[PDB]
Amino acid sequence: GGLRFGEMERDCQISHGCSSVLRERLFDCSDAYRVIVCDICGLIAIAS
Amino acid sequence: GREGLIDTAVKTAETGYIQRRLVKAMEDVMVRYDGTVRNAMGDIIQFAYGE
Amino acid sequence: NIITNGLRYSLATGNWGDQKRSMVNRVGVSQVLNRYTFASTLSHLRRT
Amino acid sequence: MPFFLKELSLTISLHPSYFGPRMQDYLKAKLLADIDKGRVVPGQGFAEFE
Amino acid sequence: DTGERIDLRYHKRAGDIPLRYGWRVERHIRDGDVVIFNRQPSLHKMSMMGHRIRVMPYSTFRLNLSVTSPYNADFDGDEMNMHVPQSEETRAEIQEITMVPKQ
Amino acid sequence: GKAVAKEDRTTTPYMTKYERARILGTRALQISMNAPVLVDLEGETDPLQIAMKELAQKKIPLLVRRYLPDGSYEDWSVAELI
Amino acid sequence: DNEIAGQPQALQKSGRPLKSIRARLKGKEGRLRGNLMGKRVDFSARTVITG
DNA sequence: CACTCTACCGATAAGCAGACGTACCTCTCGACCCTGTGCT
RNA sequence: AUCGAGAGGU
DNA sequence: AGCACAGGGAAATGGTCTGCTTATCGGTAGAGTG
């Protein structure tokens, strides 16, 4: 299993000012996912 | 010594909660390119960081 | 099966009482004996 | 035969390999096959042109 | 280029694969690579700092003595975490903002 | 959002440390994806070092769109930034 | 919401309260504190430190 | 046209309940019931 | 796998 | 006629903080009386 990147670590990276570090740790390295949203109603669409 | 140990074991949690509360209150306050300190709503907190 | 299963369950899980009142029952009355060192076992047998 | 002259917009993503003097010729051909300042997409490196 | 992932362990002829521009190689982290290093609880900014790798024997994380204070760390059993940045942007941020000397 | 004129710009004329980190990271990422290098290479293999040496010569072809709190913005060249 | 005050909880067949949507979203282990503001991350090592 | 008995919307607090709680990590150990009803 | 309980580490 | 075993089953009683809901209660305001 992976290691927890918690609230305090997120705060530390915020005070550092490293926006891309947070984006990588919390999106690209944990649970990256993609959805299609409807521009009219703003809800996830049926995408093939 | 027992009192010292108890104080440690309680103070750790007390301060952890305090710090989480503090960070949540001021996480959005940032220095802007016009020199002012503002929060995420654009409200001016200071007109110059640290005055 | 009543007495047998009840005593077995209470001593096994430590959940102290009926199986159906798990939340209201006391917990941790029974603990796996600590066989790491003779002294640790002696200590575990005398714990309050 | 009603023909309409209209102004339209498109968002072109361009690979960094094309980031040279001939960038604008490539975009026009891609627009024809399928210019604003190029916004470099964070985390990807492409450039978005409107 | 198509996103397919060649596993060099289970590819019978891994070593004989010419590389083509645009591909990626997940290469072992080597000496001099930049990583984030931290201890919990992370009470302030200085608890996550950038370090340059030195791959070396034995199973412990070894670090300079004077860096213990910002981590509030000592060697009586403390365990620390290491995060490897996975992009050029993240590497630039760690190296240019977060590094230990800058701190 | 309205672009501010080059003469009316009021933001600092220096590159901020955050701007420097972002610029180096973005240029290094573009170089790693085969972006043409605007500086002579002496055998460097790390895209980040290539971007650093491009920066030293102010050869990074990037802008910084600094946003003011009201939404107006100023475009600063990496070359003209101090 | 299974933590309604003044109502009987919707128990489990194993004598446990059901996990309601509010319970899934609530708490440190909920979605917004255990899965969104914090996460388990890839490409991370951990071990003992020596000098 | 001096009075004093009830109508008022106010404010007063009153007791009420309901709502909150350091971080990260390692491991072990235990996990429904009751009764209809066909089978043989 | 999930859930609960307990023992521990800094 | 007594138990498998899937169908049919929920029951004897054993910290300070805010916002709502109630009693309390003046300060006038009608006038009801004079």
Task: Give a verbal description of the structure.
This is part of a larger assembly, with 2 copies of chain A (48 residues), 3 copies of chain B, 1 copy of chain D (50 residues) and 1 copy of chain F (82 residues). With 48 residues, chain A is mainly alpha-helical. Chain A is built from 2 helices and 1 strand, in the order E-H-H. Chain B is an alpha+beta fold. In chain B, 49% of the residues lie in helices and 14% in strands. Chain B has one helix at residues 2-26; strands spanning 30-31, 37-38, 44-46. In chain B, strands 1-2-3 form a 3-stranded antiparallel beta sheet, with no helix packed on it. In chain B, strand 2 (37-38) and strand 3 (44-46) form a beta hairpin. Chain B is elongated. With 50 residues, chain D is α+β, with helices and mostly antiparallel strands. In chain D, 22% of the residues lie in helices and 16% in strands. Chain D has one helix at 23-33, and strands spanning 12-14, 39-40, 47-49. In chain D, strand 2 and strand 3 (47-49) form a beta hairpin. Chain F has helices at 17-32, 47-56, and strands at 63-67, 73-77. Chain F has a single domain (1-82), classed as RNA polymerase subunit, RPB6/omega (Eukaryotic RPB6 RNA polymerase subunit). In chain F, strands 1-2 form a two-stranded antiparallel ribbon. In chain F, helix 1 (17-32) packs across helix 2 (47-56). Chain F is built from 2 helices and 2 strands; from the N terminus they run H-H-E-E. Chain F is of the alpha+beta class and 82 residues long. Chains in contact: A-B, A-D, A-E, A-F, A-G, B-F, C-G, D-F, E-F, E-G. Strand 1 (3-5) of chain A pairs antiparallel with strand 1 of chain G, so a sheet runs across the interface. Chain C binds 3 DNA and RNA strands through residues 9, 12-15, 19-20, 22, 24, 27-28, 30-32, 34. Chain D: It comes from Schizosaccharomyces pombe (strain 972 / ATCC 24843). Chain D: It is found in: Nucleus. Chain D: This is DNA-directed RNA polymerase II subunit rpb7.
